[PDB]
């Protein structure tokens, strides 16, 4: 069978249908708006205690408690307000590449390079956190995990596959396939009905969590997508790649809307997160710094320059009150 | 209000207790569940080796998890699909990766078609050949060593070092040398 010409003519039809819907660019629309100006954020807090590089961090829904994972094998919950460590969970495998805080606040998931997503229960009767569940159905390293509720969790693995589990029974409810590279990150929509995932094949796919199908696929990047995050509206998202460029895609337009790149920026991107209103786009780079882009004018609005090593993770509170950046330097800094 | 302070005190006590164990172990990646660990001990020093199985053949993303290890054990396979050239390319990628440029590499080495220059290569007389050994196999071994040193010496930056060989005592001594070189570079003496 040689239907590859059928495949290429179909993708060409897709490209022309995308071109027909492209009236103009986001710049021609947001050419008259006023720039946000110089955004200067000071390091309000510096959490210390991790003995190794922090790979991931996550805020709780109360904006006070944050969980950070380090490859010393320790998951620590910090009350960002008073810098005190609320919890310090010791992990079985030390290469935790992803940590998630449940929205209710009772559980924390962690995983990476052990093919297992471990769910730890916090609000326990014995007064000591313990392994609640061990989800083991993946064949590649866990790159990201996110809670839907206390009973459902979505994960993405290095085996080019996402999964939706049932934590109570501990078995894969749904399996999302279609990527051709390591899925490096995922992002749950605000309504949680959909979630987008970026992989190492320079493509980002949108999955309906209720079914198992792939709604849309987005291209435009030239290298591996390392970070992804929905717009607070839920109708667009942003991806960072190794080509030192952010791309803002729109779901209803099916094509990319904005590109954020400077000629003096030649280092990849490790983390991306919008602010509360979506006007700013915070992206951590390999230059050891973060950049705050104007997500409408595509012009750099600021640079958070306090890290001595590559920024690994980046998160923004649900109320947009602080920005927590972790790093291979082993220190989490809260910016405001 | 205040109970959080005693909780934090106990937690930092546990953390200071764990830091002594963490800084006392030497992590080692082995490149031939999701990762197989192995604790062993030499001269009361606890080494922790990790051979990573059940992963795909794409390494460019998870290899970055092993830049803070003491050394990367690198076992090549020559004694098919020309496996030695693939090992050379993998070693080159590891040597020139911007995150693994500070991680040393221990090389364990446990044909003229894929390398015609081997048909015109002379064994250096400065070698150390053990008796009862075919000149052919020692010539091949030193040729592979030179092919790997042609990559490990063309560098221009990075704090990495190469320790080729031709069994845990060699890894122990090489980690000791790595630690000595790191301490020397901390005082800017090297």
């Amino acid at each position, epitope marked *: 069978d040689q239907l*590859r010409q059928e495949a290429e003519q179909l*993708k060409n039809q897709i*490209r022309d249908a995308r071109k027909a819907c492209a009236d103009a660019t986001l710049s021609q629309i947001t050419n008259n708006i006023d720039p946000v100006g110089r955004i200067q954020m000071r390091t309000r807090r510096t959490l210390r205690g991790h003995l190794a590089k922090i790979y991931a961090m996550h805020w709780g829904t109360d904006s006070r408690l944050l969980v950070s994972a380090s490859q010393d094998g320790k998951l620590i919950i910090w009350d960002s307000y008073t810098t005190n460590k609320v919890h310090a969970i010791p992990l079985r495998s030390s290469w935790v590449m992803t940590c998630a805080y449940a929205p209710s606040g009772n559980y924390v998931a962690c995983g990476g390079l052990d093919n297992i997503c471990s769910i730890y229960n916090l609000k326990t009767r014995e007064g000591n956190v313990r392994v609640s569940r061990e989800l083991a159905g993946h064949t590649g390293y866990l790159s990201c995990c996110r809670f839907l509720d206390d009973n459902q969790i979505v994960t993405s693995s290095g085996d*080019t596959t996402c999964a939706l589990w049932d934590i109570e029974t501990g078995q894969q409810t749904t399996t999302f396939t279609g990527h*051709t*590279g390591d899925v490096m990150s995922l992002s749950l929509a605000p309504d949680t009905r959909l979630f987008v995932s970026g992989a*190492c*094949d*320079a493509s980002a796919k949108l999955w309906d969590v209720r079914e198992g199908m792939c709604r849309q696929t987005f*291209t*435009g990047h*030239e*290298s*591996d997508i390392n970070a992804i995050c929905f717009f607070p509206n839920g109708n667009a998202f942003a991806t960072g790649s*190794d*080509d*030192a460029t952010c791309r803002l895609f729109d779901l209803r337009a099916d094509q990319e809307l904005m590109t954020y790149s400077h000629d003096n920026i*030649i280092c*990849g991107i490790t983390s991306v997160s919008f602010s509360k209103s979506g006007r700013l786009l915070l992206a951590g780079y390999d230059d050891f710094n973060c950049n705050v882009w104007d997500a409408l004018k595509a012009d750099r609005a600021g640079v958070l320059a306090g890290h001595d090593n590559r920024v690994s993770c980046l998160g923004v509170t649900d109320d947009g009150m602080a920005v927590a950046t972790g790093s291979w330097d082993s220190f989490l800094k809260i910016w405001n | 209000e205040k109970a959080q302070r005693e909780a934090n005190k106990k937690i930092e006590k546990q953390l200071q207790k764990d830091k002594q164990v963490y800084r006392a172990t030497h992590r080692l990646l082995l490149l031939g569940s999701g990762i197989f660990e192995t604790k062993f001990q030499v001269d009361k020093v606890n080494f922790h080796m990790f051979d990573v199985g059940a992963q*795909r*053949d*794409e*390494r*460019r993303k998870w*290899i970055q998890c092993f830049n803070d290890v003491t050394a990367i054990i690198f076992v090549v396979a020559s004694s098919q*699909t*020309n496996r030695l*050239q*693939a090992a050379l*390319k993998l070693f*080159d*990628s*590891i*040597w*020139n*990766n*911007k995150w693994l440029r500070d991680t040393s590499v221990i090389l364990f080495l446990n044909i003229e*078609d*894929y*390398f*015609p*220059e081997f048909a015109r290569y002379t064994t250096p007389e400065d070698a150390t050949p053990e008796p009862g050994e075919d000149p052919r196999v020692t010539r091949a071994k030193y040729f592979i060593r030179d092919e790997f040193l042609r990559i490990s010496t063309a560098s221009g930056d990075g704090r990495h070092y190469c320790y080729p060989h031709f069994n845990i005592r060699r890894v122990f001594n090489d980690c000791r040398d790595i630690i000595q070189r790191m301490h020397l570079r901390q005082y800017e003496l090297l």
Partner: nanobody
Amino acid sequence: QVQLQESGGGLVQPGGSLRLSCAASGFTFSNYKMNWVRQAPGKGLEWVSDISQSGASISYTGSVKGRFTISRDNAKNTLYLQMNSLKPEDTAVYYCARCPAPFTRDCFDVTSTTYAYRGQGTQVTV
């Protein structure tokens, strides 16, 4: 959309000569180091040749050293493998591969199966 569409090469008698072309589209051809890999009938992928961004540093595998020549053209964004004195051990599918990241001297995950940023390949049989 990384395309990496390669063409050229057919059935040529032993000792002949061919020129495999590789037109790449969807990225800046000058920022990435390019490679030629090949897959023999019933064998795993293997690395053949490479060329840097500008084109100064060039390396080949031992078997094709002196016979094959790689050359990139950044103005036309095209890779070329000029092969001559072909041997009966060169019949294979030739893929035009790309390094995953720009401005890097290392090149991971090439020669691996199910690796993106790689062309479909041309069947060069002798």
